[PDB]
Copies of this chain bind each other. A is one copy, B any other.
Amino acid sequence: MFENITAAPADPILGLADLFRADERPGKINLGIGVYKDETGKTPVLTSVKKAEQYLLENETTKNYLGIDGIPEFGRCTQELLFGKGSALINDKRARTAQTPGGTGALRVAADFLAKNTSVKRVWVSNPSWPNHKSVFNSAGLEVREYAYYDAENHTLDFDALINSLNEAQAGDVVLFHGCCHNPTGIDPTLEQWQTLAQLSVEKGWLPLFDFAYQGFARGLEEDAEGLRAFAAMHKELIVASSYSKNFGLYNERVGACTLVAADSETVDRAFSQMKAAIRANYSNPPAHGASVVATILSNDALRAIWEQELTDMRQRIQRMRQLFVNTLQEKGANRDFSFIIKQNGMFSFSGLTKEQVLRLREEFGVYAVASGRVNVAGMTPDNMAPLCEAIVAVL
């Protein structure tokens, strides 16, 4: 049965980790995958997380199954993070949340749901976007169309092209939006642009699907949800796949959520019952650990206070790093002007390097970035900033 199976091509993002660890050389630098690193070049487990885990070790009495949708407190907490405490979506019981194996699992359950209970056939994903978006949607049978986004020349959000591209989307089509920290550009729409997109979306009859994997890394928890909230004020239906991998440093525990919003409770309940059907045919129920950590931290005033501070520390370090990056690039003799880097949000930055430059950076200098020229700014430390910038300049 397997004699003709052809070897699959490696993921541009994940296949990178393989090559890196296989690569010898002490000075090799890894600016690939979106994982946060502190001043020392480590990706530690948050203190708030260590505290919640101890609480669980001593207070957990059973590992009995969690129920299709997961931990309730967990769901209640993400809806408030996404929509705000007062929010009418919460008060009118228009939203349901299912705990999932990461933001990726949230996208998949959403895709499986849409493909089998809805008349959706195509999903619109930005150009450029996280490579794994198309793979997830394609796996459920949906087709992926692309819309313009980034203006490579000015390094801006080409809104006209965005609008003009989306004008080809039909009523009933899904349009995937990045909540904040657009991967891999780092460029996000303003509140004005977000409201405009909201209006357009309501007139054209598109189903908004927000991917929120970096809430907290641009401006703040509440600020980063401004766009989504603008959409939720106008739409009767929307789906949101959120992740707690980055803002909680819970990468390998797979903590995410798939929130479904409908015109009313009665409707959302019927729709959600089908979503739970898609989950049962996939993994049954979700992994408790990482999600219990998130809920215990969010449900406790002291623990949440410590967490929120840890998060702003991460955000601010990233911001110090991209600033240092630009200066050191100019200082080291880079000919091109990379000031636009300071204008981007999140863990990355679209360096604007060519595929060949990225290849030489790796082969010749052990510096690892994604073929698209995306580099993890959060992987830069004051100690690797110099050799890194020298490698880059010797390739421009």
Q: Residues on A close to B: CB < 8 A?
A: 1-3, 5-8, 11, 14, 17, 33, 35, 42-45, 49-50, 53-54, 57, 60-68, 100-102, 104-105, 108, 112, 117-120, 132, 135-136, 138-139, 172, 207, 237, 249-254, 262-263, 267-271, 273-274, 276-278, 280-290
Residues from chain B with Cβ under 8 Å of A65 in the complex: 17, 33, 35, 251-252
> Nearest B residue to A70 by beta-carbon distance?
B252
Q: Are A62 and B50 in contact (CB under 8 A)?
A: no
A142 CB to closest chain B CB (Å) equals: 12
Q: Which residues on the B side are within 8 Å of A108 (C-beta)?
A: 281-283
**Interface contact A283-B105, CB-CB below 8 Å:** yes
When C-beta atoms are compared, the residue in chain B nearest to A37 turns out to be: B64
A61: chain B residues within 8 A (beta carbon): 42, 44-45
Shortest CB-to-CB span from A392 to chain B, Å, is 25
Give me the 4 closest cross-chain CB pairs, A-B, nearest first.
A287-B287, A252-B288, A139-B281, A101-B283
Cβ of A204 to closest chain B Cβ, rounded Å:
13
30 A-B pairs with CB atoms under 8 Å apart are: A1-B237, A2-B270, A5-B117, A5-B267, A6-B274, A7-B270, A8-B274, A8-B277, A14-B280, A17-B65, A35-B64, A42-B61, A49-B63, A53-B57, A54-B57, A63-B250, A101-B101, A101-B254, A101-B283, A101-B284, A101-B287, A102-B283, A105-B282, A108-B283, A112-B139, A135-B277, A139-B281, A252-B285, A253-B288, A287-B289
Minimum CB distance partner of A270 in chain B: B7
CB closest residue in chain B, given A172: B1
B contact residues around A49 at 8 Å (CB)? 63
- How far, in angstroms, from A273 to B102 measured CA to CA in the complex? 22
B residues less than 8 Å from A207 (CB atoms): 1
Report chain B residues within 8 Å CB of A63.
Answer: 43, 45, 49, 249-253
Least distance between A174 CB and chain B CB atoms (Å): 9
Q: Which residue of B lies closest to A114 (CB)?
A: B1
CA distance A262 to B67 in the complex (A): 36
Beyond contacts A101-B283, A101-B286: 6 other A-B pairs, Cβ-Cβ < 8 A, are: A1-B120, A6-B270, A44-B62, A49-B63, A104-B283, A138-B281
Choose among B1, B64, B104, B290 the residue that contacts A284 (Cβ–Cβ < 8 A).
B104
The listed residue (B17, B100, B250, B274) touching A67 by CB distance below 8 A is B17
Write out the residue numbers on chain B whose beta carbons fall within 8 Å of the beta carbon of A14.
Answer: 67-68, 280, 284
> When chains A and B are docked, how far (Å) is the Cα of A276 from the Cα of B270?
34
Most buried by B among A45, A50, A132: A45
Contact A66 B8 (CB under 8 A): no
Complex-state Cα separation, A267 to B2, whole angstroms: 7
What distance in Å separates the Cβ of A214 from its nearest Cβ neighbour in chain B? 16
Shortest A159–chain B CB gap in Å is 26
| CB-defined contacts of A269 to chain B, threshold 8 Å | 7
Report how far A359 CA is from B15 CA in the complex, Å: 53
Residues in B neighbouring A100, C-beta threshold 8 A: 283
